[PDB]
Each structure stands twice: as structure tokens, then as C-alpha cells.
């Protein structure tokens, strides 16, 4: 069958999905996630979009403002709108699968609603593709591939320049925050290759 999704769980509760097309496959995935980790997923969803203060109050308003200032939601929606039908099925199947279990949960809450929803006082809402994409953008791109301290580096550099003078402040800056250090242990041995680019280390842009 093309309409059938079979879910087998192992001795540790780990789900295996058997399905024949993309949409059915990711629908199954979505569905077991909603069974296993619904409260965790809902708090992650609020965390990555900055909607925590709506269910947890005033201590989370700065958090929510910080999250929203660090991304541009329409740029994400435009990337989702350009996907081909096969790629769009991954995301749409997954949200549909979650939705199918959330519908049963919101219909049968006396036995199926995760206890923490009662504890924190709110209930799960339905997901769309945008929400699935934002789980990965928030907790992986926006947080683990976004590091810079360029502004604070400039404040240190300026403070070293005042202490040791202009040329000397720069060389101490290079002592504390070198660009490259040729003795660093590297995952690729020097006999295999080295990085070809060379960079300015004088702050030549001022």
C-alpha cells in the first residue's frame, strides 16, 4: 500500500518507520516525535521563535525580543516557497504527522495530554513546515553557527592602543588574539594539504 505507514518500536522504545513515499515516511517520523517528545518540542518551538513569554510571563520578554531581533522570518518563508515538491514533502509530511497526533491529544486529554501542559497551564497547537524549519535554524544555525565578538574585539584593541600606543597596541592584540598559530594541532596533517589563503592582520580597513 501507498497509504500505509507501519511503525515498529524496539526494546528501547526506538521507532522505525516503514512507508512508500516521502510524505508518508516523514509523516510517520512526525507522529512518533509527537508521541515521545511533545512538550519538549513545543518549548523548543517557542524558544526558536521567541514566543515563551506568552505562556511563561514577564521573566522571558528580553529573551523573546533577543530571539526575534536575530533572524528575518520572511527570508525563511521565501526559502520554503522555492522548494520543489519532493523537498517540500519532507517538511509538510513531518508537520502533518505531528498534527495527526496533536489532534488525538487535544480530543482525548484525560489520558493523552503530557502532564507538563497541565502543570504549565496551556495546550499544544498545530505545526506548519515553517515551524519544522525553525527548530533547525534556531538551535543549530542561529545558535551554533553564529559566533562573533568583533565589536568587543574592537573595544579591546582600542584599549590596548591607549595603553601601549598605536603600533604596540596592535602587536599586543596579535599576541592575545592571533589570526593563525602555525603550531596548532590540526585534524589534517601538513603532508596532506594546508589552507591557501592569507589574511590581513593589521586592521587595514581603518
Amino acid at each position: 500500500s501507498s497509504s500505509e505507514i507501519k511503525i515498529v518500536r524496539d526494546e528501547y522504545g526506538m521507532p522505525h518507520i516503514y512507508a512508500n513515499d516521502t510524505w508518508h515516511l516523514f509523516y510517520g517520523y512526525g507522529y512518533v516525535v509527537a508521541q515521545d517528545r511533545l512538550f519538549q518540542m513545543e518549548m523548543a518551538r517557542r524558544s526558536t521563535q521567541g514566543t515563551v513569554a506568552e505562556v511563561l510571563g514577564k521573566d522571558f520578554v528580553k529573551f523573546d525580543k533577543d530571539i526575534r531581533r536575530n533572524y528575518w522570518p520572511d527570508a525563511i518563508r521565501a526559502q520554503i516557497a522555492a522548494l520543489s515538491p519532493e523537498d517540500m514533502s519532507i517538511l509538510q509530511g513531518y508537520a502533518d504527522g505531528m498534527n495527526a497526533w496533536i489532534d488525538k491529544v487535544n480530543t482525548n486529554p484525560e489520558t493523552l495530554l503530557p502532564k507538563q501542559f497541565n502543570t504549565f497551564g496551556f495546550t499544544p497547537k498545530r505545526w506548519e513546515p515553517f515551524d519544522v524549519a525553525m527548530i533547525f535554524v534556531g538551535t543549530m544555525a542561529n545558535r551554533f553557527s553564529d559566533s562573533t565578538s568583533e565589536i568587543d574585539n574592537l573595544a579591546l584593541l582600542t584599549a590596548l592602543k591607549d595603553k601601549y600606543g598605536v603600533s604596540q597596541g596592535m602587536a599586543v592584540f596579535n599576541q592575545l588574539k592571533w589570526l593563525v598559530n602555525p603550531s596548532a594541532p590540526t585534524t589534517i596533517a601538513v603532508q596532506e594539504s594546508n589552507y591557501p589563503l592569507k589574511f590581513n592582520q593589521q586592521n587595514s580597513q581603518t
Partner: protein, 557 residues
């Protein structure tokens, strides 16, 4: 996050072994999610953070993959020129361009709603503005516009069957991440993935650049520039977030450096110690590195040279002799709360003193506080992440290497004094602090061990579980949030692949409304603490053989 991949020429009783320990911190419920996907071109098994559509850790029976954080510099800040008159505009290539802007309302439970505006230029969202200089800073990411494609490259790569197909998808992943490869024939590979800017000449990537036009990136560097190796001459690939390659520049973070002192050397020594390794020995490297003090190796030679002409009754020297007898592996006593040897507490107090006398002294306040931590700072709940060598300590290591360090010592961090005098003074500070708390008999010093907490708050500081769901482990272990091992062509089985993992506390986070906890809520928690692991299944027969339940759905789109 660490990774070791062992190929054909180093593997014993197998052709290839991959061990991965992604380090994200420790949480309840579990950071990652176990999942097997069988259909539409996919046949995979493994676990992945936040149940991503694509599996960050797993295999499809032919190849296996894993990740560690790349820390390349893929983000630069652009100083935009504003105008007091004509606000909402910024100068770019000789014209006054208007900003993108959007309004946001923060609804607040039991409070009033708050609305604010977000601003964006051609370089990116505006971080902060300086009205005084009429400058606004825009953070510009090289991956901007490729977030969704990176998610998809992590999904499609699960179908690759060889290096060529896998690197096609690696070339589309735009975030700074190391990717690793292993296969049934014993081939192994590594790619430092991501999109890196093609910067104009003279652009120093550690500091801001004017956003007026002339400093704009030229584009993105081609995938041929990304550091990558296939079937390395050494026979193995090891990483612990250290540099990918000779001359590759690191993130611009002031607290992050790739220098001569690096924790990956701890993995290297163990993999070079034996000519070949079995899967059991590859897995055992998790237990040794978990427990290894990272500073002993670095500063023991300096301590030994400094106290060499001291008498046996000089306490400074007694401190160095205790360190010389130690292999640096921390082990708990029987009480479950103190370490068996006082080495880490000694290095901690020594290093704090040495930093305060050298690096900290050369830097103006308030920047001196960036360089004072010894790397042992924790609280009662323990570290929130991996233990590393602190920045201050990496800078001090270069200084104690003298003219053997490639880094010009523009200021002498020892301020005219012979090194040994500064080392001995710090050692006197150490003896004074520790003997006052523990007494003079070094052999009965019972110093406090670090513990490990599975937090109910996720990594942002937001609750994802009730506070009582927090779990405590007596021994802190410097190891991945989950560990997974894949063994290809085992001589000891008829199966072409064997894989294991451990996802603690368990697969499920479900608690019924009556307070009844799921059966798989915590069945992996003790396994985690003792370095155990569970089998990952991939084939239909193995899944059927270990089935505990089945659910069938009939749905049409």
C-alpha cells in the same frame, strides 16, 4: 564535541570504526532523538538533535556519518553609516538606501504586550547602533539565505553510497560544521563544511569593516577551498573542535583560539599508542578522555624545571612531586563526592595565580576579566558543557614556550622576572590556600569532584520539563551528550555493519496526566553513567527480532 574515525590500516577486526561524542550539554528529556527510516530511497538508523528530519549521527548500511562544531569565521560585522536627518537610511555605494524594518509584538502571560522594531540592511540585521557616531552594526552571516538548504543537505546525505555522492551534499551544507565519513570498504573522510566569505584584500576578519561599499565581500569561496581529506596517510581522523588544517583561521571570538595547547592531543596520544585498535578499544577512549585533566600535560614540565633546585621539605616542591606521580586521570573515591588525587585542585589554584600575575596584568580593565579563568570554574550542578583549556592558559602556554612559540611576544608577560620566579611565587600562593583548608598532610587531601546534571531547562534557559525532572550523576564526564559507534565489516559477525548508541535519560519524555511515566523514560540513564551502550538496528529482520510493539496507519494526502 569529539570524534575519532579509524580506517582500514589502523582498525583491528573490522575495516572501519567511527566514534562520535557531540557535546551540547546534558538535558532531560534527551537532547537527541532515536529514529529509523525505511522507505522512499532511505534506509537509515541513528539519533539526531531535536528530531531533525536529517539524522546528524547514524548510518545507512553502506556509509556512516557524524559531526563536530567547525568554528570557522563565517560572520563579520559591518559598520553602517547613518544620517541624523534621513533616518532609516544608510549610505551604500554612493546613495542613501532605505532599511528593511518589521514590527513585532511580544504577548506576555499576565502582563502588558510589548512592541519593538527590527531593522535590516543589505549586510544583515542590525545588532546595535551608536547614535553618537551615527553608526549601526549589521551582523552578516555567510550562510544567510541557505538555512533551509543546509537542513536538506543533512537529509539527502543519508542516501549517499560513496564519497563522491556524500561530498555533493557536503558542498550544500552552509553552516560551519565538521562532517565525517566512513564506509563498508574501510574508506574514511573529513570535510570542514560551510560557506566562507571571499574577502577584499586588507580586510582583517577579527574586527568590524565599514558598510559603505568598498569592504563588501566579493562572494563566497568555492567548495574546493574547504579543508578536506580522504584516506589520510595516518589512518585516522581525530577532532575535538581543534583546527581543521595548517593556516586555517578560527572564529573571531576573543575567547576562542587554536594554539599549541589544544585538547585534541589527548585523543591523538591514545590513537598513536597502539598500532591497531578494536571497537572495544575505540569505545574505551571515551572513558579515558572523559576523566583526563587537560592542563597537567601542558604545565608539568614548567613546574618540574622550576622546583628542581628546591629541597625536599619545601612544600612547593612537594606539590610538584604529587603531580609527577599522577597520570592525570581523575577517579571518584568511595564517597561519591571527592577525587582520589588532589592534582586538579592544585593546577586550578596555581593557574589562577599565574594568570593573575601574567596575562591579566598586561590587559587593561575591564578586559582583564576575559583572561583570568583557569578553566575549572563550575558550580554545584557541575559544568554546563565540555571542559577545555582556557584562553588565558593557551596564551600563557605560548609565553612559557619562549622563542619556541611562533607568536611574537610583543609584551613580556613575565615583566622582566625570570619565569621560575613567577612559577615559584604562584606555587607558594597555591600551598597557602590549599594547606589552610585541608591541612599540611597532602596524602589525606580529599578535594571535591565535579558532578553532572541533566537539566530540565534547555540550552536557552527555557523549561522543557518540570524542575523535579532534573537528573543528577555523581561523576562529571568530559564526553558527548550522546555517544555512538559504527563498526564496518566486523570479522566477528556475519553482519556487514554493527552500530551502538546511548540516548539518556531515554527515548521518551512522556508523562501521562495521572503522573505515570512512560516505560522508556529513564531506561538509558544508568547505562550512560557506566559507559554502556545499546545496539542500533537497521535491517528488517533485526527490527522484527527486537520488536516490542507495532502500530499501522492508513493515510492519504
Amino acid at each position: 564535541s569529539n570524534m575519532w574515525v579509524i580506517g582500514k590500516s589502523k582498525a583491528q577486526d573490522a575495516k572501519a570504526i567511527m566514534v562520535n561524542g557531540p557535546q551540547f550539554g546534558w538535558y532531560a528529556p534527551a537532547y537527541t532523538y532515536g529514529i529509523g527510516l525505511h522507505g522512499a530511497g532511505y534506509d537509515v538508523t541513528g539519533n539526531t538533535p531535536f528530531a531533525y528530519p536529517g539524522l546528524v549521527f547514524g548510518h545507512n548500511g553502506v556509509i556512516s556519518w557524524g559531526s563536530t562544531a567547525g568554528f570557522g569565521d563565517d560572520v563579520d560585522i559591518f559598520a553602517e553609516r547613518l544620517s541624523a536627518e534621513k533616518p532609516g537610511y544608510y549610505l551604500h555605494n554612493g546613495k542613501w538606501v532605505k532599511m528593511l524594518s518589521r514590527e513585532e509584538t511580544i504577548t506576555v502571560k499576565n502582563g502588558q504586550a510589548e512592541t519593538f522594531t527590527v531593522w535590516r540592511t543589505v549586510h544583515g540585521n542590525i545588532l546595535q547602533t551608536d547614535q553618537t557616531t551615527q553608526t549601526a552594526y549589521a551582523k552578516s552571516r555567510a550562510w544567510d539565505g541557505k538555512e533551509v538548504a543546509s537542513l536538506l543537505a543533512w537529509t539527502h546525505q543519508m542516501k549517499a553510497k560513496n564519497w563522491q555522492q556524500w561530498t555533493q551534499q557536503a558542498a550544500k551544507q552552509a553552516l560551519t560544521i565538521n562532517w565525517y565519513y566512513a564506509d563498508v570498504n574501510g574508506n574514511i573522510g573529513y570535510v570542514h563544511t560551510g560557506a566562507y566569505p571571499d574577502r577584499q584584500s586588507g580586510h582583517d576578519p577579527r574586527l568590524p569593516v565599514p558598510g559603505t561599499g568598498k569592504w563588501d565581500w566579493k562572494g563566497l569561496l568555492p567548495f574546493e577551498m574547504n579543508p578536506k581529506v580522504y584516506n589520510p596517510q595516518s589512518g585516522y581522523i581525530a577532532n575535538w573542535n581543534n583546527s581543521p588544517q595548517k593556516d586555517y583561521p578560527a572564529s573571531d571570538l576573543f575567547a576562542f583560539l587554536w594554539g599549541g595547547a589544544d585538547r585534541v592531543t589527548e585523543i591523538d596520544r591514545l590513537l598513536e599508542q597502539k598500532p591497531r585498535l578494536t571497537a572495544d578499544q575505540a569505545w574505551d577512549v571515551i572513558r579515558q578522555t572523559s576523566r583526563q585533566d587537560l592542563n597537567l600535560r601542558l604545565f608539568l614540565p614548567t613546574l618540574q624545571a622550576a622546583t628542581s633546585g628546591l629541597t625536599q621539605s619545601d612544600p612547593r616542591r612537594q606539590l610538584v612531586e604529587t603531580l609527577t606521580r599522577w597520570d592525570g586521570i581523575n577517579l571518584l573515591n568511595d564517597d561519591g563526592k571527592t577525587w582520589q588525587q588532589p592534582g586538579s585542585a592544585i593546577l586550578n589554584v596555581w593557574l589562577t595565580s599565574m594568570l593573575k600575575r601574567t596575562v591579566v596584568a598586561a590587559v587593561p580593565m575591564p578586559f582583564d576579566k576575559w583572561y583570568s579563568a583557569s578553566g575549572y570554574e563550575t558550580t554545584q550542578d557541575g559544568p554546563t558543557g565540555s571542559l577545555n583549556i582556557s584562553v588565558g592558559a593557551k596564551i600563557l602556554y605560548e609565553a612559557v614556550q619562549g622563542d619556541k612559540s611562533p607568536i611574537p611576544q610583543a609584551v613580556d608577560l613575565f615583566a622582566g622576572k625570570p619565569q621560575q620566579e613567577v612559577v615559584l611565587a604562584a606555587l607558594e600562593d597555591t600551598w597557602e590556600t590549599l594547606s589552610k583548608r585541608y591541612g599540611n598532610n597532602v596524602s589525606n587531601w580529599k578535594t571535591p569532584a565535579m558532578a553532572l546534571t541533566f537539566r530540565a531547562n534547555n540550552f536557552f534557559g527555557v523549561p522543557q520539563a518540570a524542575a523535579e525532572e532534573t537528573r543528577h550523576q555523581a561523576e562529571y564526564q568530559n564526553r558527548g551528550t550522546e555517544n555512538d559507534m559504527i563498526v564496518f565489516s566486523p570479522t566477528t559477525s556475519d553482519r556487514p555493519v554493527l552500530a551502538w548508541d546511548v540516548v539518556a535519560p531515554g527515548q521518551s519524555g512522556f508523562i501521562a496526566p495521572d503522573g505515570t511515566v512512560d516505560k522508556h523514560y529513564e531506561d538509558q540513564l544508568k547505562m550512560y553513567e557506566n559507559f554502556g551502550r545499546k545496539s542500533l538496528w537497521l535491517t528488517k529482520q533485526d527490527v522484527e527480532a527486537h520488536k516490542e510493539s507495532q502500530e499501522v496507519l492508513h493515510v492519504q494526502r
